[PDB]
Design an enzyme around this catalytic site. Sequence first.
Site, mmCIF file in Angstrom:
data_model
loop_
_atom_site.group_PDB
_atom_site.id
_atom_site.type_symbol
_atom_site.label_atom_id
_atom_site.label_comp_id
_atom_site.label_asym_id
_atom_site.label_seq_id
_atom_site.Cartn_x
_atom_site.Cartn_y
_atom_site.Cartn_z
ATOM 1 N N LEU A 16 -9.117 76.365 77.463
ATOM 2 C CA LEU A 16 -8.176 77.445 77.068
ATOM 3 C C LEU A 16 -8.399 78.704 77.913
ATOM 4 C CD1 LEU A 16 -8.073 77.227 73.156
ATOM 5 C CD2 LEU A 16 -6.251 76.666 74.782
ATOM 6 N N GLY A 17 -9.620 78.953 78.403
ATOM 7 C CA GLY A 17 -9.916 80.200 79.133
ATOM 8 C C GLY A 17 -11.363 80.347 79.573
ATOM 9 N N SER A 18 -11.687 81.523 80.133
ATOM 10 C CA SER A 18 -13.021 81.932 80.654
ATOM 11 C C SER A 18 -13.278 83.422 80.367
ATOM 12 C CB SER A 18 -13.134 81.627 82.123
ATOM 13 O OG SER A 18 -13.103 80.226 82.351
ATOM 14 N N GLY A 19 -18.738 82.575 79.385
ATOM 15 C CA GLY A 19 -17.864 82.414 78.202
ATOM 16 C C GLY A 19 -16.621 81.580 78.500
ATOM 17 N N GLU A 20 -16.764 80.242 78.498
ATOM 18 C CA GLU A 20 -15.662 79.247 78.600
ATOM 19 C C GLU A 20 -15.181 78.902 77.180
ATOM 20 N N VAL A 21 -13.859 78.809 76.982
ATOM 21 C CA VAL A 21 -13.180 78.582 75.668
ATOM 22 C C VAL A 21 -12.412 77.253 75.717
ATOM 23 C CG1 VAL A 21 -11.365 79.488 74.121
ATOM 24 C CG2 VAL A 21 -13.002 81.046 75.172
ATOM 25 N N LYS A 36 -15.649 78.719 71.831
ATOM 26 C CA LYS A 36 -16.175 79.536 72.954
ATOM 27 C C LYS A 36 -17.648 79.167 73.139
ATOM 28 C CE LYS A 36 -16.499 84.430 74.270
ATOM 29 N NZ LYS A 36 -15.715 85.686 74.363
ATOM 30 N N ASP A 118 -11.089 95.277 75.144
ATOM 31 C CA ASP A 118 -10.465 94.428 76.191
ATOM 32 C C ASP A 118 -9.063 93.965 75.761
ATOM 33 O OD1 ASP A 118 -10.557 93.270 78.799
ATOM 34 O OD2 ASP A 118 -11.248 91.330 77.966
#
Lengths: 242, 244
Positions: A16-18, A19-21, A36, A118
């Site tokens: 899902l994203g990047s 701490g990789e999710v 995460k 953020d």
Amino acid sequence: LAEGSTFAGFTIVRQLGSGEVYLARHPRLPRQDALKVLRAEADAAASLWHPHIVAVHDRGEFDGQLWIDMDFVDGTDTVSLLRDRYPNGMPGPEVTEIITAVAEALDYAHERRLLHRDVKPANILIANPDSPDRRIMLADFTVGTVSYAAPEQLMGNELDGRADQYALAATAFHLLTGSPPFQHANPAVVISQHLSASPPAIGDRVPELTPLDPVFAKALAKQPKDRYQRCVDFARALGHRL
Amino acid sequence: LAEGSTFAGFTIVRQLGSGEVYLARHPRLPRQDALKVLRAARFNREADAAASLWHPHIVAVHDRGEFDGQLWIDMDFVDGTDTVSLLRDRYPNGMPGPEVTEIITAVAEALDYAHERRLLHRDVKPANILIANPDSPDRRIMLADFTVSYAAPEQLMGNELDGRADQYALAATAFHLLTGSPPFQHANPAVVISQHLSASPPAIGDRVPELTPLDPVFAKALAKQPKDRYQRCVDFARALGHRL
Ligand SMILES: O=C(c1ccc(Nc2nccc(-c3cc4ccccc4s3)n2)cc1)N1CCC(N2CCCC2)CC1
Ligand SMILES: O=C(c1ccc(Nc2nccc(-c3cc4ccccc4s3)n2)cc1)N1CCC(N2CCCC2)CC1
């Protein structure tokens, strides 16, 4: 670096994203969660209970890697919705909907002495965007996304809620046009414009949006004292003209 | 059971309701959760519907498990009041009309959402209707836990259920919230059961004269045959609103 893999009982489905999710099937419940993972302590996220803030279920350590199990928002982030539809900008009423929802989440977190730090289009998720079950969610409570960071936060000064307001306003600017207030390949230039450059007129990018000029002038102010008091005040000032 | 006891890592704080439900400190996160525990059917208790549901007015389940032969469900703790305590301590003769339409509409939506996904609550009652920060702008009505006072006749008989069973319960709940007492009140549960099955639904006007206009609304939602009720829970909630 994991697909069809098992991690702390979770089955990995997608990155899902990047701490990789990762999108992951829960070990006991028949549903998909956002997992995460770290390689080499945000309890505040568990502190927050809001219909527009992504919920944390649990935290833990599996083979030296720290993990956070949280709600999976089955839809898109605003980045993807901007690039695949609305490359030049989202309709005004849809932006007021999203910014109001996120403004509420942030104002709630601020009242409890917690800053997001953020706020950006990639952290604004929308489940079932084209359904009645439509749900706007705020997630993820050296050169990162300096595109939306407030000058006082870049300088490492004492923060308050008005830092997240700046980020939300920068986010809204992006959503309405197809670009952030300050765009440059060199992060150092973007940082310098946050600190020193007059905030740009949104009307200079999209003529129809000229009425919002003083709204973004205010919310993107250099001094926090010159912004709105709360994020919903900014969201309402948007609504008034959209 | 014991307050201050540890159960599946959770620290028990107090019993919230009754499947006994405790307010508990989470083993790893610094927050309070609602822990529902069973004593001694396991397949049934594995109605993993609740994890399937993600709605702003339905209490979230975090995790399920087994600790020393007892099945447990970790779920959100709604820090506020249930509608039971609101009736006992604030409005013994019934809540204001506008506040009831707010609560019933919110719960009607949660139930209608769950019904569209082929999932029934099966136990709608004042004790399952929670309100976090009741007196604050952060006010939030929640339906939790996805006594014969609110059970629909078809459900008491163990017949085939649909959404209209939860509607009956919600209407019985609304009757209680408005008047101070459920539609059928008697010390003997067997009598309450018999009235659910056989007795004409009572006129809400016969308890609170000001509420006479709602008579046909409760007559309809508390109908014996499900087919004679409203199609959706929000239809009932709207019929309330119209006359409040
Ligand atoms: O539109 C999305 C999207 C959908 C749902 C979620 N949900 C969801 N829920 C809950 C939490 C989170 C997240 C939390 C978090 C924290 C840090 C960094 C990223 C994230 S994402 N996300 C997040 C995205 N995607 C398309 C583009 C994206 N990229 C990266 C890989 C290929 C291209 C992959 C996924
Ligand atoms: O007003 C409340 C109350 C507050 C918060 C919650 N939260 C909360 N969160 C999450 C889930 C749940 C529940 C889950 C559940 C499951 C079955 C039956 C009832 C429930 S209540 N509850 C539930 C109640 N109380 C007043 C006194 C009451 N006494 C007197 C009579 C019995 C004990 C119990 C506590």
